[PDB]
Point group: C4
Chain length 352, copies 4
């Protein structure tokens, strides 16, 4: 009677949201080629069990950046998810909190950093979105101060942002009432929705990456990599953690699938800092893989929204227990007692 | 007027069984990826005939473990097949017996080892299913005593058992009346269906593999391998015969197809002991292949159940003569006079 | 208004013939895998033009076995095609004759070798079909005497004949009235349809291949090869011409596509004798290829029958002018003035 | 409300034109295999971004043959496009002119070289089509005199022209009223539509290529190459610019896709002269690629016609701004400030 498939949701929460909503969450750049190459990508990595072993106990338990995120699956910073159930961002922090992991939110948020954190005690990150003039950035960066956003997911792949068709036919009406309370309205001194669609700096660089550092610590991640030329470059320029990504295949298409493009990104920066790929991932079967390639922990996107929008704080709370309760088969059946015994020593992958 | 296709059955016996039944037999883990990669897998091995030769006579005749199983195709231990025609397990032993091969039954059986063997004279194996406390196991192992189950198909791939979707939506009602008469009801001393779903040991190891040996002989097979790290390991730990498998792709998905994963499993353990892969196999065309790779004889699963459930003792009795009467084209047309002249010397295979 | 596609016919002549008929011509072994791998096979060989050259004149003109078969496309020995328009075999000899090539007919013919040849002056071959006792063979072989069948297409791939599904459900009624006038009725001395399905020798060998030679010359071809172990073997045992084939994918499935399996068959027997692959070929685009791989001339099957059955002597007479009038684009556009300048020097092929 | 997809047009302008029209523009040779291998070809080249860079400014700006074609996308010489909106050829020159690029027209044109050029000031080329007797050619070549067609796209792949099915069933009625005003009617001295289908020389060669040169300069391009044997041959025989092509896959099928066949064509003729591939290209995403392989600028075909036929001078005027406004994402997001920083150093491609 209860129904389990971690995306059986996509389609139910499809009928729950107004065209615009579903398409804002369900898009990809122009041809969207990499959308399905975000799922049918992990299918090109064949398993490789080991057997006749003790599996009474296992161990999802992590420690990313000196943080025990209860289990190795994390949440990726989706834009306005308060449109998809007026709470969203707010109940995701509490959901993850009960779930013991991270609830990562972007600047494009409905609930502000002032606003969400009232949800109380738990680990969470916040996506930086550098703009033209860095006075408002500088203050946003230091907003997630000793409130605690631990790190800052600086998104290096979103200067001019990807051409997801849909939007500009069914012209995305940013819901009149509903607001992006993370800035909600700024200006210098002489607006919302298109303030945010009224600010960013298309020339963000490893020199700005420089500045950001003297304005904080909060472990500055590299969000938006699929190559090793900006990987070794990433250790070359002081940091830890990487958020290898395509942008939910929303910025640029025909750019390799996070998993597929991974080996070269991990293998590049060796032992310096750990990598976390946030994309494609919708089951612990395929989650396993990423962790096999060398990406110590992984985030989650869309799957998390077709859940709140579907059924409140229970929505995502299965998106996480179904997810967690899927990495205890995968780790078990392949002969592993915890992350320690995983690695791509333990498998086979199509291309190779 | 008579209709032949060895799975033309699947679909007829589909309409014969209640949702649950069909789905219990027709499932695979979560995404079921390897389900079709269990058939469209052998299609990646191209034939390689030799011609202008004598084919008046041929030779399916075997001898696996010092047993002439009439012909090289065997039966794989399906769970309750008495649900799918109240007889099942019972009429499969008699069917195979008339068919001269092995009728392999699991612990998850409807008819008990006491019960089925009344069917009379013929070769058959029985799948061991080690549990938490090994007093009931120890006695089950020695149940198939000088009754004669020859070997024991110890299933090394089923600690925590695979997540076949279906079941847990159309919540598998283990048919109130109908019972798993192989244990049927045990307990220590102070139940059925969930006794069996109330017992097993998730820490089965090559140390338990040790014990089993001082409690019997009955040639202890290795059921559930798709790698050569647990293959050489399998000769390292005294035994013969292997039952390379995925579990009807029921335990774990995206783990190579028995045929595909085979070369490394045979090639690993060389000349020590013979290997038998039970999975995917539904025609002697594709049966041939396995035997070409080096797997001396092969078992059969699903195909055997969509036959009893379809048409009694005649059901499977074609599943075997259609099967047998399909290895006498294959062996003939490729220039072979018997198994002796087969081998993967005689072919070509996609990956290679 | 006139419609051209050399198989646009298949489907029209599909609706023209009784189930049995269409399926007798439109079958393949069991799963028929190689049926489409008989067409989507040549699609894995990419073209390779050369340009800015003289193409005022071209040259299909051949000489196979010291025979100028007007153009390089030939006809392959289909069984009873008199069922598919009561004339067939008869009007195919006359059709080819006007078309200047070969009209190859099998022993399974409706019109006898006595019977067809009344059609008059033109080149044609006849498929040998050796049987249990070789007294009737011996006389059939020497039937196509100084009448003129030039060569004998001895079919080395048809001892026990392929399991084309269809037939044995819609039980092939060999049309009561209509007969296989090539033997029509023999017996020793103490019947038709199942005389022929009442005679053959499953032990045909390179020792019988020996005998045949002292009973004739008529250039003994090797029909039914897809490997180089029976190729060099084919020069080892005195002959010329090969008829590399799968049997319209009717004998055995999953055995490579004539084109695909070709390189190794030509490349094997070098300069000794020429090879001709009869299978898959339905356009001069793809015809070209075979000739590129090294198969000096090629035969045609099915395409020739869905034409007589469709529209009399005009049917096949387009199957040949459409075919011929398709090799004068292919040769032209790739920079060639005749066969002399073709070869696989001139192309690219997927596998490679 | 406004709808963007650069071929969302194909289907609208499909319903706008009479069968013949759509099929004249929407055909390909016989099986049309390379039609989709003209699009799903660029999908086998995976992107390869570089990040955290300045993208305030970018640079489509070109200079092909000492010509700043405003942006790197050009127009390919489609036949009668006046059938598809009586203006066509005429409004394409003006469209491109406002768009700052080239408007390339063929001899098969509706509007003559006398006729179109009244449109005024802007860069444009004209496809040469050498005929049997070169008196009319000689005068056409020197027609695009100091009027200014800069170069001459000499089409080396169209002696005997490709067999696009369609046409010859729905027998292409060259619209009675409407004429090919580029010759419109010539004759020696003792007609239209089949004058043009009444003249050409199937023996065009690198010796005629010789002559053409002493009758002009106008940079003689090589239109119709997919190999490096006629590439080095192309520098061997004095010229610049190449127009690597298949002919909209209209001449010959199964001949590699312009992009796919490119590497060998560029890599062959090195630094001698620049190459421009006109085929497949319908987005700046995929446009990028060509330019990555080494083809300095690229032309466009069909996409340009399903636009005039769709909506006048605004039709193509989006086919160019949508196109141009799609190379400013692609160049931006991959880290590039202009063409200078592109190249296939910057990517990954399936085959490799
Ligand atoms: C609605 C939406 C908006 C997005 N906006 C951002 C953003 O503001 N910045 C960013 O770096 N990631 C953004 N993401 C992408 C994610 O943070 C994350 O990479 C992605 O959704 C993971 O892919 P998956 O959905 O297949 O798990 C966006 C994704 C969606 C669904
Ligand atoms: C209904 C069902 C229950 C199964 N239970 C067992 C089991 O108890 N233990 C075991 O090792 N095999 C079990 N198998 C799998 C087989 O023994 C065998 O590997 C498989 O069905 C062969 O795959 P095929 O169905 O494609 O031939 C199960 C299969 C099915 C269909
Ligand atoms: C109806 C039918 C009967 C056949 N019987 C014979 C036969 O008697 N012996 C033989 O060697 N070829 C036989 N062939 C196959 C051909 O001679 C030839 O290899 C084949 O039809 C070429 O394949 P295509 O149909 O794709 O051109 C048969 C084919 C068909 C269609
Ligand atoms: C209707 C039509 C007629 C064509 N005729 C010519 C021609 O006269 N000569 C030539 O070299 N190119 C001709 N082309 C092809 C182009 O010049 C160009 O290579 C092609 O249309 C680019 O392919 P695309 O349509 O996928 O962009 C023809 C194409 C079409 C659509």
């Amino acid at each position: 009677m209860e129904i389990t498939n971690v995306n059986e949701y996509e389609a139910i929460a499809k009928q729950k949201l107004p065209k615009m909503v579903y398409d804002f969450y369900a898009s990809g750049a122009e041809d969207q080629w990499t959308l399905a190459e975000n799922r049918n990508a992990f299918s090109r990595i064949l398993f490789r069990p080991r057997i006749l072993i003790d599996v009474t106990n296992i161990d999802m338990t992590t420690t990313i950046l000196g943080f025990k995120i209860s289990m190795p699956i994390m949440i990726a910073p989706t834009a306005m998810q308060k449109m998809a159930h007026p709470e969203g961002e707010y109940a995701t922090a509490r959901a993850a909190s009960a779930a013991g992991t991270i609830m990562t939110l972007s600047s494009w948020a409905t609930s502000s950093v002032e606003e969400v954190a009232s949800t109380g005690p738990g680990i969470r990150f916040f996506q930086l979105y550098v703009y033209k003039d860095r006075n408002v950035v500088a203050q946003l960066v230091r907003r997630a101060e000793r409130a605690g956003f631990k790190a800052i997911a600086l998104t290096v792949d979103t200067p001019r942002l990807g051409r997801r068709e849909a939007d500009i036919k069914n012209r995305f009406v940013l819901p009149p009432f509903l607001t992006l309370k993370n800035f909600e309205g700024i200006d210098l001194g002489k607006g919302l929705s298109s303030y945010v669609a009224g600010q960013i700096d298309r020339s963000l660089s490893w020199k700005d990456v420089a500045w950001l550092q003297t304005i904080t610590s909060l472990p500055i991640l590299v969000k938006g990599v699929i190559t090793a030329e900006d990987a070794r470059l990433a250790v070359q320029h002081g940091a830890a953690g990487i958020i290898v990504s395509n942008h939910g295949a929303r910025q640029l298409d025909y750019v390799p699938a996070t998993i597929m493009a991974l080996e070269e990104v991990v293998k590049a920066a060796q032992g310096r800092i750990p990598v976390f790929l946030d994309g494609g991932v919708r089951r612990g079967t395929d989650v396993f893989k990423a962790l096999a390639l060398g990406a110590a922990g992984v985030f989650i996107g869309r799957p998390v929204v077709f859940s709140l929008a579907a059924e409140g704080e229970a929505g995502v709370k299965k998106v996480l227990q179904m997810m967690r309760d899927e990495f205890e088969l995968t780790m078990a059946l392949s002969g592993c007692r915890s992350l320690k015994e995983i690695s791509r020593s333990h498998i086979a992958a199509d291309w190779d």
